[PDB]
DNA sequence: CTAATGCGAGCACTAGTGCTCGCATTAGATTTTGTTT
């Protein structure tokens with residue numbers, strides 16, 4: 001997914017990445033998406049909660 | 051090296067002014083107060099203040115930060131009182147101390163090299179401030195270090211204060 | 223994360239301990255060693271697992287015998303050096319036999 | 321701009337979460353203590369007694 | 371004056387100070403209008419997430 | 420986080436000298452819970 005989004009190169013994606021990652025890599029955004037998803041899975045309607 | 055070869059390499063014998071670390075990174079500022087652009091630029095600038103060791107002299111300090119008139123430096127871990135004397139927060143030492151350290155260093159190299167040629171390959175991991183070399187070491191499965199085993203134990207190193215360390219170096 | 227160190231001390235004092243643990247397996251030396259064997263079988267051209275197996279009780283090569291293997295070929299992979307030692311060594315050597 | 325600071329909802333959630341967490345830890349302790357039939361031992365560690 | 375009591379009252383008062391300064395830095399180093407502005411500014415980023 | 424360190428300022432007492440006040444920075448500190456067969 002991440003590679004696909006970097007390929008699109010949409011301004012918004014870079015806007016998000018820049019904010020929730022370090023100056024060297026993007027692993028923190030990876031952990032963020034994992035975490036948000038996992039949390040949303042405890043709702044009867046995950047996508048609505050998101 | 052730089053001091054020992056200064057005369058030959060440069061032209062004149064020199065004096066240790068210090069050793070400094072520069073943190074290469076693109077910092078992020080976490081401020082509770084709203085900052086104007088100039089203030090932000092100042093905070094970013096501050097994030098690059100160099101740690102390390104200095105020579106405890108007002109002149110050396112002023113040569114490292116010609117901006118500093120009074121107070122704390124934003125470039126080095128030094129500061130000048132209203133007096134104009136060095137702040138005691140400053141990370142500095144005297145001449146004797148710098149030379150003391152460098153001598154200790156060469157001692158370390160001599161002894162180590164000696165033991166290396168002596169064929170010393172013993173498994174002796176240190177432990178200091180809960181930090182071990184093992185965490186970053188690729189050879190954990192080669193050494194097969196087992197603390198539960200008798201004859202396998204860490205080397206406890208006491209994290210002493212600078213004054214204590216230099217004290218040891220002098221007495222040794 | 224406190225449980226293992228508790229178990230070790232209570233076991234050290236004759237007190238039987240049970241605990242369903244979910245961590246610590248891969249830092250056990252036997253596991254590192256057996257795994258190393260499996261890796262070497264998958265691909266011997268991994269210096270660290272090979273050296274691990276050689277130094278383990280599985281083979282019992284000591285530090286001298288290890289550096290001795292290295293001397294046959296310094297630049298190549300450790301496996302290459304081992305093969306070379308075999309190629310040159312005489313069957314009367316203990317190291318050769320290992 | 322290279323600046324970051326908590327928004328109001330972040331602080332709000334941090335406060336909320338702290339008291340929710342403490343509340344639960346309390347309950348956790350209750351479960352622990354109520355497991356015992358006849359004997360209870362409470363063991364802890366600190367730097368200095370006095 | 372009991373020495374311990376003097377110090378005890380001092381401690382409590384300083385406690386009050388700390389509580390207020392924590393309150394101030396938490397909520398009132400920025401105007402409410404500024405808080406709302408920063409918040410609203412963050413909206414597009416959240417949508418991408 | 421929090422605790423200590425130091426430096427400088429002021430406010431108050433009986434102009435200097437005490438001590439509260441404030442700011443700014445290191446130093447040390449800390450080490451997840453469950454869901455299948």
Ligand code: SF4
Nearest residue numbers: 175184187190193195
């Ligand atoms: S891992 Fe084995 S080799 Fe690497 S440091 Fe710890 S003990 Fe020495």
